[PDB]
Amino acid sequence: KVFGRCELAAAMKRHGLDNYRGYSLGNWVCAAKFESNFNTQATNRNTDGSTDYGILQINSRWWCNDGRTPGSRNLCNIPCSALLSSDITASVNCAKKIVSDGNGMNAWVAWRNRCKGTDVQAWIRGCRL
Ligand SMILES: [Cl-]
Ligand SMILES: [Cl-]
């Protein structure tokens, strides 16, 4: 599923991400925009053999199990496939664990390079929330 902008904002707001660990909703929509272009089915292979999955591109090296990342962990205790669902609950719950691990949203390289320090509020402007 390819979300619309206001549509994803609303769903992320249904699931508790607005101001989670201090990050307003615009930060999370901005991050999804550049990680996946709002597509829950996005996947991308990393040079080390790990893979990023879903609308927030969560990595198999640490957070989910795909059966093909030697030496990895599965700290969210989920198969990576569950991160591709049109329902975003699994991605949201694992994101909450990631952003609380010490480095905040700097865990998402694309947030650091494309959202951090910008007018992220523009990503929710106009939306009925
Ligand atoms: Cl915002
Ligand atoms: Cl980047």
Which residue type, as a one-letter code, is found at position 103?
Answer: N
Q: Which residues are catalytic?
A: 35, 52
Cα 113 to ligand 2 centre (Å)? 5
> What angle (nearest 5°) sits at the alpha carbon of residue 51, between those of residues 95 and 28?
30
Cα 26 to ligand 2 centre (Å)? 17
Q: Give me the residue label for tokens 């909703």.
A: 25
Q: For residue 111, what are its two tokens?
A: 């947030």
- Domains of the chain with bracketed CATH: 5-124 (1.10.530.10)
101 labelled binding-site residue: yes
- Report resolution in angstroms: 1.9
Cβ atoms of residues 63 and 76 within 8 Å: yes
Secondary-structure breakdown of the chain: helix, strand, coil percentages, each rounded to the nearest 5: 40, 10, 50
Distance CA 27, CA 33 (A): 10
Instruction: Tell me how the structure was determined.
Output: X-ray
- DSSP for 66-105, written as a single string: -S--TT---TT-SBGGGGGSSS-HHHHHHHHHHHTSSSGG
Distance CA 45, CA 26 (A): 27
Q: Which ligand is nearest to the CA of 35?
A: 2
